[PDB]
């Protein structure tokens, strides 16, 4: 059960999630998005824990925890991380150059609050360094996330790596055989072959005919959390819908939702996304920590030359049929007669929200699933 | 399995089907087309049987069986008709209607029944309503009411009428689910939509999509894979003219060799299509000019009357599209909501059972 300080930081992490999601969604180089608000917040905590003066205060400001004291930030984020331990695997490792030795007090605190691991790596042996990072991520996620990055640009600073595996476990499972091959429309001119999973059930649903979008709430195991999916009616870039996506608009949409018979079709499989949050966090106010000249990470090691080179947020999010069983007489009940369609064969936004606290576990978007390009025979 | 003589006549009936289909498709008055090549061939065979000199030889020439002997032609088409008589519903009737005054020759009656299962009837065309009632009742009984009417009017009342009444219902090798039926709009033209009932099914079918010629071709096997229904359709709504220019015996062979078994989501109009053609003017255009003209006609073997001529060749068909059949990768769509061409081919011989087109289904 969440303490008042952890409950406060859950608010600040969710606020930062919307902030970070929006910044990344504006970046044209970004396709799929997968963000864990608590994990993103924890990274700033580590900067606030390992940094001094302006480097540390900027991290607190990005988190919007200016009024909060260092103690409640670290203990509160630590409590939040522990609360999430639906199958979920998380690993945090700080990689520094072979020359540097991390401060004993920092090692104690980062392991205590953030379960942060510490590793000295020789970036000069590029292949070996990448192999070490990728093997660590692979073991953390039991092979679900076998690779973080194919290249490390900044080789003179600290790398923070977060390796994650998340698999939503439905409150009402999909039938294991209700799986087939469909075409996913990345654009109206680009189709990718995907595996789709299907289910007709009673779900909280809303169709905005004015804003031309659909919103469905999929409860997770034991109704402790829910997966919310936002999708336009037509195949279009998510930009328009992302302009509408605010904490207040989400509250409006959710109050308009009603339990209806919905026929859901979702892509099935693992979505692997690696983000380097470095430039994005800098854009949000973490400028000093990422610049070699201005960085003050003296609490982390004892050397001013040490800076934050990267913040890797690597996630393997699995869409599968597995969930809790349900009574089969549900279908004999005409409640499920003429369902609404939630046919996710084009880009959508999704959120994983704790039903009780309202805390955001995940925020993301599926723009381009893994699969081969098809030819829409009927396309003109 | 077909004898070498029936096999040769099967080639010529199918060749004639393409020739006749093309002639009728050029006629702007013609909407839907429904032709049974063997039945059309048999009609010419009857003209050769009941006719002498140029009347008979023209019939043989239209059939392209000039090289063959009269007997070989009659026996081979007769074998063909019989061979196409398994788990698919098919009803066929052939009746020769002559004026009340005329009496058919006993030997002709024997031979036309033997080879062509042709019935003979004397009718008084002066009592128009009674004459039409007799023809329509005969066609209805033949098709068990599926084809209740042949024609609303008989123009030429002084000659012989050949009436072919048919009912054909393809029985699928893999049935459609009885509940997978709904109402859709059929695009007759880009500006004209008619409300139809559609039946749907996703399955493994021989399919080919010509990206260049902007058309799709699907093969739907019939009960026990003894025959197949082939559907040819442009990607979008357009007049069939462009596609009909491509439709040759050789091009169909090319397309069929290019087909591959793929997952296909089929949507077809469901119901009975009733088509009555008077092949008289079309067979005349193909070379049967003498049998069709009262002055030149020689049907002396048929009765003993020179005045006797071929007034009409009614090819009346009721073709039913239904869900019924035998129990059973990202699919391609074969969404038949616009005009298409279809063929029914015996998988073994290659012989064409049917050639047609659905341009305007019944509906509002």
């Amino acid at each position: 059960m969440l303490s008042p300080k952890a409950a406060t930081l859950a608010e600040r992490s969710a606020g930062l999630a919307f902030s970070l999601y929006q910044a990344m969604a504006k970046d044209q180089a970004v396709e799929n998005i997968l963000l864990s608000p608590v994990v993103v917040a924890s990274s700033l905590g580590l900067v606030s824990l390992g940094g001094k003066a302006t480097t540390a205060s900027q991290a607190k400001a990005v988190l919007s925890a200016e009024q909060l004291r260092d103690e409640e930030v670290h203990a509160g984020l630590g409590e939040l991380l522990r609360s999430l331990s639906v199958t979920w695997k998380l690993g945090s490792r700080l990689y520094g150059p072979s020359s540097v030795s991390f401060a004993e007090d920092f090692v104690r605190s980062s392991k205590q609050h953030y379960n942060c691991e510490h590793s000295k790596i020789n970036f000069r042996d590029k292949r070996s360094a990448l192999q070490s990072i990728n093997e660590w991520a692979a073991q953390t996620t039991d092979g679900k996330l076998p690779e973080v990055t194919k290249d490390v640009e900044r080789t003179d600073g600290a790398l923070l790596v977060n390796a994650m595996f998340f698999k939503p476990h439905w409150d009402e499972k999909f039938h294991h055989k209700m799986v087939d091959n469909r075409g996913f429309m990345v654009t109206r001119s680009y189709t990718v072959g995907v595996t789709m999973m299907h289910r007709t059930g009673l779900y909280n649903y809303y169709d905005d005919e004015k804003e031309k979008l659909q919103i469905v709430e999929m409860p997770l195991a034991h109704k402790l959390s829910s997966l919310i999916i936002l999708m336009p009616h037509h195949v279009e870039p998510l930009e328009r819908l992302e302009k509408l996506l605010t904490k207040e608009q989400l509250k409006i949409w959710m109050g308009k939702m009603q339990k209806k018979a919905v026929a859901i079709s979702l892509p099935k499989g693992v979505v692997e996304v690696t983000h380097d949050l470095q430039k994005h966090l800098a854009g949000l106010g973490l400028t000093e920590a990422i610049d070699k000249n201005k960085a003050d990470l003296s609490r982390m090691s004892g050397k001013k030359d040490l800076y934050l080179a990267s913040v890797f947020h690597a996630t393997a999010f699995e869409w599968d049929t597995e969930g809790n069983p349900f009574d089969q007489d549900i279908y004999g009940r005409e409640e499920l007669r003429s369902p609404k369609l939630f046919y996710a064969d084009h880009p959508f936004i999704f959120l994983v929200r704790d039903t009780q606290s309202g805390s955001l576990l995940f925020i993301g978007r599926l723009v381009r699933p893994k699969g081969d390009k098809m030819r829409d025979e009927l396309l003109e | 399995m077909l004898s070498p003589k029936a096999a040769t006549l099967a080639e010529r009936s199918a060749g004639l089907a393409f020739s006749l289909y093309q002639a009728m498709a050029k006629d702007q008055a013609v909407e839907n087309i429904l032709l049974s090549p063997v039945v059309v061939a048999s009609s010419l065979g009857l003209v050769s049987l009941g006719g002498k000199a140029t009347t008979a030889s023209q019939a043989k020439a239209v059939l392209s069986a000039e090289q063959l002997r009269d007997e070989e032609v009659h026996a081979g088409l007769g074998e063909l008709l019989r061979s196409l008589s398994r788990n698919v519903t098919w009803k066929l009737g052939s009746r020769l209607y002559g004026p009340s005054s005329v009496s058919f020759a006993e030997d002709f009656v024997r031979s036309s029944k033997q080879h062509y299962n042709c019935e003979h009837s004397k009718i008084n065309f002066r009592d128009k309503r009674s004459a039409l009632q007799s023809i329509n009742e005969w066609a209805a009984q033949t098709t068990d009411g599926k084809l209740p009417e042949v024609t609303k009017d008989v123009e030429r009342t002084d000659g012989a009428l050949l009436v072919n009444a048919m009912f054909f219902k393809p029985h699928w090798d893999e049935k459609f689910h009885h509940k997978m039926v709904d109402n859709r709009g059929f695009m007759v033209t880009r500006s004209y939509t008619v409300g139809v009932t559609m039946m749907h099914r996703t399955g493994l079918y021989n399919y080919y999509d010509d990206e260049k010629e902007k058309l799709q071709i699907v093969e739907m096997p019939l009960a026990h894979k003894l025959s197949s229904l082939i559907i040819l359709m442009p990607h979008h709504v357009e007049p069939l003219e462009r596609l009909e220019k491509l439709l040759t015996k050789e091009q169909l062979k090319i397309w069929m060799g290019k087909m591959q078994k793929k997952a296909v989501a089929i949507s077809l109009p469901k119901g009975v299509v009733e088509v009555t053609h008077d092949l008289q003017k079309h067979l005349a255009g193909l070379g049967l000019t003498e049998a069709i003209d009262k002055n030149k006609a020689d049907l002396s073997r048929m009765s003993g009357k020179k005045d006797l001529y071929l007034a009409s060749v009614f090819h009346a068909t009721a073709f039913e599209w239904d869900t019924e059949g035998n129990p059973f990768r990202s699919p391609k769509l074969f969404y038949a909501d616009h005009p298409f061409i279809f063929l029914v081919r015996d998988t073994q011989s290659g012989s064409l059972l049917f050639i047609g087109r659905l341009v305007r289904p019944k509906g509002d």
């Binding site: - | 997978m180 709009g185 749907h200 099914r201 996703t202 989501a265 949507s267 969404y335």
Partner: peptide, 15 residues
């Protein structure tokens, strides 16, 4: 066992 996949959706609107 689950039922068959449903019918193909209706044709899209003109451009």
């Amino acid at each position: 066992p689950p039922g068959p996949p449903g019918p193909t959706g209706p044709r899209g609107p003109p451009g």
